Amino acid sequence: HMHNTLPTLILGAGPAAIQLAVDISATGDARLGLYNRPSTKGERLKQYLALTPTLYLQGTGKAQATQKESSVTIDCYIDQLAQAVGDWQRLILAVPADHYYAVLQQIPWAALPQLKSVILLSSSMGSGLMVQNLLNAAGKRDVEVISLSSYYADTKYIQPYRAYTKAFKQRIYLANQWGNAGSAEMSWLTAVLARHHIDTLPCSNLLAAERFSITNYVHPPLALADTTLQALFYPEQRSQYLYKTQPEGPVCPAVIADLAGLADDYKRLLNRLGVEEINLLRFLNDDNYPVPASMVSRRWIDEFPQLPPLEQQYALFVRYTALLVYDFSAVKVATVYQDANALWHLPRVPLEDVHKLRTLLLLAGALDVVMPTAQRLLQRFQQALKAFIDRVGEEHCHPSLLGDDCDRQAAIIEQQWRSQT
Amino acid sequence: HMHNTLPTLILGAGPAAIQLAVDISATGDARLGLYNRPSTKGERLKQYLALTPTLYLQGTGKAQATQKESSVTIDCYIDQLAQAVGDWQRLILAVPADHYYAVLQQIPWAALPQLKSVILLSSSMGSGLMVQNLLNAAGKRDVEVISLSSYYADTKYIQPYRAYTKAFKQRIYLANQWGNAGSAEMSWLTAVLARHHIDTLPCSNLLAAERFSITNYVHPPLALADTTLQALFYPEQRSQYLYKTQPEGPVCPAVIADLAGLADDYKRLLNRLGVEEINLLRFLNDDNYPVPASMVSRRWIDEFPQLPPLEQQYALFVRYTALLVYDFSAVKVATVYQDANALWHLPRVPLEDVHKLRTLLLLAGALDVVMPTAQRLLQRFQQALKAFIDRVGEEHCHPSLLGDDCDRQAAIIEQQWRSQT
């Protein structure tokens, strides 16, 4: 019953999962399982682990202070979610948030009789309400659902069983569905993260933690800018950088206006759901990556939500200019690509961000709130995407380009939310 | 009497003077004289020319289109202004504008019986009113005084008799004291500059051309920023770049606010003198160095003077950010330096800019107009300068650090201006 010895199944074998597995193994003696879909990467890891079931992690730079060379044994590896069965008591979703639904629908909940908690490692707004709904339908209402605002480190590959961590986050916001402050699981998570001096801040409900997911605010305006969509869908033109100013990347007044406007839209939606908006600029500067006060004053930070729109935008433009002088300058914009079957794919940025934002947009329309900036970003993306599918032909596109389950997710979120209000 | 054959004495042998000498020699057969003070540079040029009296110019890059390799003979070189005598009919002041007074006071006007024009090559606001006053006192009221808004090229050394020109200006504003549109001299200047596709725009009076001197607007806020003054007066600390953002140079919201504010101040003063203010952002973008409209919109440019202060500043910050992505990124901030006698000197930036701005500030106070941004920039400079003189000791400072003739210049400008109004 000691929470740091619970058998723990990690779903998704991204670099974050290696760091996480090391962090659990170092805080206790727990059986560790791992899942990854049967992609090329997953298959390669599947073979590796069948021979020597150990992952490797190297702390570098800042992270070297609390993460050195480590090794962690995996007791069970699976590549079919129908095999996610047995005595597992903790599931950790390391997959991106727009895949929670597809993943949770494949888990055979009846074959997890001792399940106590499901942890949403890089949550999105509404993720926990949705997971609650799915669990409640499977008779797992007892299970504790914890949303974290983001993954807590910058981790990357070096192959698939080897990662390096550059840096750890300042703080993470988290909550379970009951607004507890310190359940056993929450205390365990705090203990895990304390090993790297990461602050944990409990929130009153799942949405009140998820509202602190930085990527919902920042990716869509940058990733869905006309000039970024053009670089994405025309793979031969010169590379763009996600955080650079025009003409090398998207940052400019119009894109900053979309950033400020999208944050306005989330405030509308969050408020409708009974949740307070964040102070975007304080969040960015003080919870994530600071810039000197000679560029972004403390006055701008503390008073941001009461500043006029144009002054909000000025402050944000200055912030992103200052950030370029973590290595934002290095983030390239990824393009469409073909897989082994020569089917075209979108990369994770913006495919994840589009799905997360489309789910919230559909939710908003159900609740009679308008999000004009979200709507303009998604209209722009959809027209670019249609044009790309016609260039290459729909038959030559992977089905991820042709549909999504955002509609059902939004309906499930609304259903859960309305059942508590 | 043909104006392109007039004997022409160029005062100041900076790189601009070499380009200018080539431009005159190529547009006519005129006797050419040259002056430079007996600095180290001037002495070295003085010896060189006594052996082979020819200067050399190389057009490079953009300028290669209308400036190739050229050579020009100097018929007379002097290093004492008391020797500025004889049949010279045109004087061209290639020296910086804060030296006009000292220079003109040394010219023996009675020994220039055929003087017809004095051309202020890189004028400042008030330069032509001041020169008028000095000429009028010497009985040279007949002489034509022409102010140009700036020097018309980016020219530099490679030694002292050899220059290269990177680029030529789009347009130059000019005027004589009578608001003519096309006197013979003005037509000659247009012909000279046309050789490089430079536009010339006649103005209704000298001040109505001088108001287009970019350096009056741009240097003081950048050069006199706290962080730039610190780099100037502490020569051992890491170099700063004049146009980069903090912490590598001064650009930040406070400095941009000084830029917008100083332009407000000049409008007050210019208006008081009967002259319309310029549109600063249109001037910068369209008459000097453009940035894409995705950064600075045409709306911001065309409407700048009616925009609210904060939006003016936003637009200016964006402009200077876009400029960094001509090689602004390369302009280093120069520091105090010792001469052969181990006396400390200020470099031309900001020493020239401080003198030009102090003259206008004293003028403004005489005319009951307040310039709070100018005043704050000069107070800041003066305190930094005092602190530096106390560190090194006043005995170890060149006298340029300890006084100026800005007071008399301002009085002379006011006197001339009042005598026409």
A405 vs B: CB within 8 A: no
CA distance B379 to B66: 45
Give Cα separations from A284 to A317, A347, B23, B387 (angstroms): 13, 25, 56, 39
3-state secondary structure chain A: CCHHHCCEEEECCCHHHHHHHHHHHHHCCCCEEEECCCCHHHHHHHHHHHHCCEEEEEECHHHHHCCCCEEEECCEEECCHHHCCCCCCEEEECCCHHHHHHHHHHCCHHHCCCCCEEEECCCCCCHHHHHHHHHHHCCCCCCEEEEECCCCEEEEECCCCEEEEEEECCEEEEEECCCCCCCHHHHHHHHHHHCCCCEEEECCCHHHHHCCCHHHHHHHHHHCCHHHHHHHHCCCCCCCECCCECCCCCECHHHHHHHHHHHHHHHHHHHHCCCCCCCHHHHHHHHCCCCCCCCCCHHHHHHHHHCCHHHHHHHHHHHHHHHCCCCHHHCECCCCEECCCCCEECCHHHHHHHHHHHHHHHHHHHCCCCCHHHHHHHHHHHHHHHHHHHHHCHHHECHHHCCCCHHHHHHHHHHHHHCCC
User: Which residues of chain B neighbour A322 with C-beta distances below 8 Å?
Assistant: 245-246
Nearest to B245 among A227, A246, A325 (CB): A325
Q: Does A292 sit within 8 Å of B318, measured CB to CB? A: no
Q: Does B310 sit within 8 Å of A310, measured CB to CB? A: yes
CA distance A315 to B405: 42
CA distance B417 to B421: 7
Nearest to B245 among A247, A248, A321 (CB): A321
CA distance A133 to A120: 14
Q: Is B126 left (phi over 0), alpha (psi -120 to 50) or beta?
A: left
Map tokens 């908690």 to a residue: A117
Give Cα separations from A217 to A267, A286, A405, B237 (angstroms): 11, 15, 22, 39
CA distance B173 to B209: 5
Give the chain A residue whose CA is nearest to the CA of B296: A253
Neighbours of B182 (CB within 10 A): 10
B244 vs A: CB within 8 A: yes
Q: Is A151 left (phi over 0), alpha (psi -120 to 50) or beta?
A: beta
Which among B320, B321, B324 is the top mutation candidate for probing chain A, defined by the most A β-carbons within 10 Å of its own β-carbon?
B321
From B324, B171, B334, select the one nearest B239 (Cα to Cα).
Answer: B334
Tokens of B348: 């031309």
Q: How many degrees, rounded to 5, is the angle at CA B409 between CA B396 and CA B266?
A: 105
CB A102 within 8 A of CB A58: no
CB A75 within 8 A of CB A87: no
Which among B226, B252, B329 is the top mutation candidate for probing chain A, defined by the most A β-carbons within 10 Å of its own β-carbon?
B252
Q: After which residues is chain B broken (C to N over 2.5 A)?
A: 158, 325
Cis peptide before A347 (omega within 30 of 0): no
Neighbours of A51 (CB within 10 A): 7
CB A259 within 8 A of CB A251: no
A245 vs B: CB within 8 A: yes
3-state secondary structure B173-232: EEEECCCCCCCHHHHHHHHHHHCCCCEEEECCCHHHHHCCCHHHHHHHHHHCCHHHHHHH
CA distance B92 to B9: 6
A167 vs B: CB within 8 A: no
From A257, A234, A232, select the one nearest A242 (Cα to Cα).
Answer: A232
Resolution in angstroms, to 1 decimal, for this deposition?
Answer: 2.0
Sheet holding A162-168, edge to edge: A70-73, A54-59, A162-168, A153-157
Beta strands B76-78; B32-35: pairing state: parallel
Q: How was this structure determined?
A: X-ray
CA distance A368 to A47: 50
CA distance A355 to A418: 22
Tokens of A132: 């609650």
User: Which residues of chain B neighbour A253 with C-beta distances below 8 Å?
Assistant: 295, 297, 314, 318
CB A131 within 8 A of CB A117: no
Tokens of B79: 């290093």
Nearest to B322 among A245, A292, A294 (CB): A245
Which amino acid is present at A189? Answer: L
Residue B345 appears among annotated catalytic residues: no
CB A222 within 8 A of CB A231: no
**For the purposes of burial, counting CB atoms within 10 Å of the CB of B51, is it exposed (0-12), middle (13-18) or buried (19 or more)?**
exposed
Map tokens 């940025």 to a residue: A349
> Taking a contact as any Cβ pair under 8 Å apart, which residues of chain A between 97 and 116 contact chain B?
none
CB B374 within 8 A of CB B354: no
